[PDB]
Design a binder for this molecule. Structure first.
Ligand SMILES: [Zn+2]
Ligand SMILES: [Zn+2]
Lengths: 128, 81, 140, 142, 101
RNA sequence: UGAGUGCAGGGUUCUAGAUCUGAUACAAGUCGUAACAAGGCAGCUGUAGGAGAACCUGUAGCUGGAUCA
RNA sequence: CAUGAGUAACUGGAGGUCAAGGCUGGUGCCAGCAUCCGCGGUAAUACCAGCUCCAGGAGUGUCUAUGAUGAUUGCUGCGAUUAAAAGGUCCGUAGUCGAAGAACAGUACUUGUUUGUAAUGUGGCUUAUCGAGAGCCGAAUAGAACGAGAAGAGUUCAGAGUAAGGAGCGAAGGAGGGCUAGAUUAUUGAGCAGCGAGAGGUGAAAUUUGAUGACCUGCUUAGGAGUAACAGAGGCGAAAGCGCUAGUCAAGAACGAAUCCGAUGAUCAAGGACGUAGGCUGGAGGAUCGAAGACGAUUAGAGACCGUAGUAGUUCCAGCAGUAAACGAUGCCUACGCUGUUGUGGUUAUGAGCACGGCAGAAGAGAAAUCUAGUAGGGCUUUGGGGAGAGUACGCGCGCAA
């Protein structure tokens, strides 16, 4: 079976390239919800509905014009606060915009919040 | 979102496979069949895996097949569940 | 092999792959100390036993002047090249010569000279360049 | 995909969204519970119990009335078999293949099918003898 | 480089096929690759039908025909000129040939 | 507690050897011409015989074929 | 501080890479030069010298190890249709990797405080004419002690039941396999009858066979192989492979649907089973075809190609062996993905679907040809690293040998 967080990313990336505005995503987990909810806070996606089908789960989402790309990293590497900027420079296009998402004892947070809260964690994914 | 994607038309529902939908659909249902002549009522399943005979008169009322089962020529039915 | 707890499998695989590199292989598994000049020494002393000449490879047309040297440190006998214009005239039988490498990665032939792997540097303790250009004289 | 061959079939049957109580039916709870335990004592497998309840007595999925699953009811009544019914059906097919090959020794296709069948037996055995459903030194009937 | 998408033969979803023998040289060729030719030939030539009309005892007569399917290997088909070499765009055109007589 | 030294064996690394047999380089020597064009018997892979030498012949396969028919 | 004075550059280069001369004289594939590419056969900006330029400069050339060049070792970050490169097919242990929902616990994980670094190195300031130098300051790696947070990972549960798996039910489909009993012709061989001179074979002919009656036409028989036409970009099987008709014996794939159990799963060193043909050990048999061997022709020569003939093999049962251009030259699970058309088997609100295919464009991709090749840090195994020598030597394991 495919990784659920990988499946999420390819589904939205392809649909964006094909110039569609909305998609249905077919297998959902707890961190998939939290990832989508992160993209909504930063205004990359607009509307979210979750379907409680008793068979795994599924979501319907509206895409914005601001989303260029997103992706998951596998495996989920452990990082000290000293390490995160290395990954930031590898993944993101510019020092000015975009988000690298990290899981922590305080939920999902971005590479700026890591400095504010003074915490590393595990690397999860990115979008710009 | 699009209305077309969140709320499909009933036409679209009927064209899709029973699993490949926002919510999966039951296709089998229960019926009350009444025998020609003796007018007794028997509960039956559509898509039956077993041949069934009328209570009392023992006429074969329903024949099992590879798909939806076949009601004998004279008999008639109503959906109950 | 890309799993988070896969480090042992990954390490053992990647180590085994390196033997496909000729460089790593020779250092590991070949005879790297067989040569008069190489891993062992930058220069080699030896005594001249015969004077010799060899044809150049095609398409060139020449006779190249060469010397048979007995190497003190190994007791092998080897061929060496004598570089300069009138150079062969500066050497007698039973002279001592110091000998040097041609500058390739492995010991390999250079230019049009087939199968010769070293060149003469000094004769009787003095620079061959100085001997040929008549800047200095034989010790006598 | 399939475990022993290159199949990718998709024929299954849909489970309902909610289950309710089958008010259209023509028997009580206690009658349905009696019908099950009778069919059990006569020696029917629990998958066949389900088929009869649907087909003849008119109850779907056999749980909406009882609030309990078929195998759990049989354990409450004490009618539990010595071997789980899945592992039991695998030993039967093995015996059949060995009885064919015993008289038609030349059949390479049947030889092929036996080694597949035998592998599946031990994979199932190792499941059950971890959940303490079989004695540790159980071995096939062969 | 690969010259044809179908490898020059009609086999798909199979391992192996029956062989047949070439009419001209008896070489073995796979059935799904062999060049095929159909023939329907009158027993009596056209230049005799006007004599047949006075020779026959019957009120009317229908001449018997003879039927054949012939098979050829590539070398023979090219040499006998059943098929010819064609340009890179023509190679793709597929059309049924006439039955011979 | 034991150095030294007898006598048999092993384990390693080097080296000699009548004679045989590989490889590589041979300006251009001798005999043919096997491959590349339908290369003058279309070529190639496995296997088995045979033969101055390239190679030839049977059997099953492949098109990278001279045919997408 | 005071006295004299007027001394003080070389190494490598100048055809391209690579800064800087078609200058003058010698030499004529010689002598030499050249990391690489290349110069010289009498008109050499490349040899040997003169003269002018260039580069660095108290320094500059060469040889040898190593780091970089190098995404040519690839964690970040390469490749495997045709350039080097996916195991012939399955089973399978160690190993690496593994649903949704509701809850729980703190050893990894991350972080605080405290320990843990003289020199060197790092961030600074101060004094030797200046600059290295010297002197003083601050923080620090890995490792350990005690607390904290709980997203991910982990453990459990069942009024939960995967477009995860296995068991089972119903109607049906197929050259899938083993066994038993039958079949229409055809090719050879014998018997007998009719006839009375040639048959065969080739591009053209000769070996060869015929008055002991050939050839061709009848009737009888004896064997051992095979299933024509229908027959296809049709079907079935793990692959290798499977085509006459009945009867019989096991298991599998797909489809329909409100059946049952509940994580039983993916991939796989070692280990095990199958594998066209040709080959080998023993038995049965022997029609046709035909390696080896023998002739007839053709040629300078044919040992070959062609023709006549002929043996092992080619068939069956019981085994060994283990290779193929075993190829769609494209590993296995699992995803996301445009349209039109044509098949095969079930089902159908007759609108369509599900499994297995063929074909034609598009968009992307790619060195192109083209597309099993589009998108992508999903999981696991095999595998390549300029030609040659070489898939060869030595050792070892299997095999009767090959
Ligand atoms: Zn009735
Ligand atoms: Zn032919």
């Amino acid at each position: 079976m495919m990784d659920k967080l990988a499946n999420l990313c390819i589904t939205i990336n392809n649909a964006n390239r094909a110039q569609k505005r909305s998609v249905v995503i077919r297998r959902i987990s707890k961190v998939c919800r939290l990832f989508l909810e992160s993209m909504q806070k930063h205004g990359y996606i607009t509307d979210i509905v979750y379907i409680d089908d008793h068979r795994e789960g599924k979501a319907v989402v509206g895409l914005s014009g601001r989303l260029n790309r997103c992706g998951a990293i596998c495996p989920r590497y452990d990082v000290e606060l000293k390490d995160v900027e290395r990954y930031r420079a590898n993944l993101l296009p510019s020092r000015g915009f975009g988000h690298l998402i990290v899981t922590s004892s305080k939920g999902l947070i971005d590479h700026r919040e890591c400095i504010q809260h003074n915490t590393g964690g595990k690397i999860l994914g990115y979008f710009y | 979102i699009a209305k077309n994607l969140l709320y499909p038309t009933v036409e679209e529902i009927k064209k899709n496979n029973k699993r490949k939908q926002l919510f999966q659909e039951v296709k089998g249902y229960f019926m009350e069949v009444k025998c020609a002549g003796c007018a007794t009522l028997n509960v039956c399943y559509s898509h039956s895996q077993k041949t069934i005979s009328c209570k009392g008169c023992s006429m074969v009322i329903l024949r099992s097949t590879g798909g939806k089962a076949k009601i004998s020529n004279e008999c008639s039915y109503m959906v109950i569940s | 092999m890309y799993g988070l707890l896969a480090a042992r499998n990954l390490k053992k695989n990647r180590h085994k792959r390196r033997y496909a590199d000729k460089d790593f292989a020779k250092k590991a598994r070949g005879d790297i100390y067989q040569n008069a000049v190489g891993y062992s020494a930058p220069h080699a002393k030896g005594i001249v036993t015969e004077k010799l000449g060899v044809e150049a490879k095609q398409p060139n047309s020449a006779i190249r002047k060469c010397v048979r040297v007995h190497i003190v440190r190994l007791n092998k006998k080897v061929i060496a090249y004598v570089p300069h214009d009138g150079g062969l005239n500066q050497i007698e039988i039973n002279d001592e010569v110091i000998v040097e490498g041609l500058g390739k990665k492995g010991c390999r032939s250079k230019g049009d000279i087939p199968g010769v792997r070293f060149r003469v540097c000094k004769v009787q303790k003095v620079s061959l360049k100085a001997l040929v250009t008549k800047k200095k004289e034989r010790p006598a | 995909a399939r475990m022993y061959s290159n199949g990718k079939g998709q024929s299954k049957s849909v489970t309902p969204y909610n289950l309710t109580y089958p008010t259209y039916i023509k028997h009580s709870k206690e009658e349905i519970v009696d019908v099950i335990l009778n069919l059990a004592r006569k020696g029917t497998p629990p998958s066949q119990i389900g088929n009869i309840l649907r087909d003849n007595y008119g109850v779907g999925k056999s749980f909406a009335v009882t609030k309990t699953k078929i195998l759990t009811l049989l354990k409450i009544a004490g009618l539990k078999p010595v071997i789980p019914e899945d592992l039991n059906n695998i030993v039967k097919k093995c015996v059949n293949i060995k009885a064919h090959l015993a008289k038609y020794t030349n059949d390479k296709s049947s030889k092929y099918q036996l080694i597949q069948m035998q592998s599946c037996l031990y994979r199932v055995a190792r499941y059950y003898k971890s959940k303490n459903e079989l004695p540790a030194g159980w071995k096939p009937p062969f | 480089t690969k010259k044809r998408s179908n490898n020059g033969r009609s086999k798909k979803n199979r391992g192996h096929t029956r062989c047949v023998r070439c009419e001209h040289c008896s070489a073995m060729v796979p059935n799904d690759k062999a060049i095929k030719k159909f023939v329907v030939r009158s027993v009596i030539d056209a230049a005799s039908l006007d004599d047949l009309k006075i020779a026959t005892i019957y009120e009317e007569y229908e001449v018997p025909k003879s039927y054949y399917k012939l098979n050829y290997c590539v070398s023979c088909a090219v040499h006998i000129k059943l098929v010819r070499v064609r340009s890179r765009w023509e190679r793709k055109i597929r059309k049924e040939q006439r039955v011979s007589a």
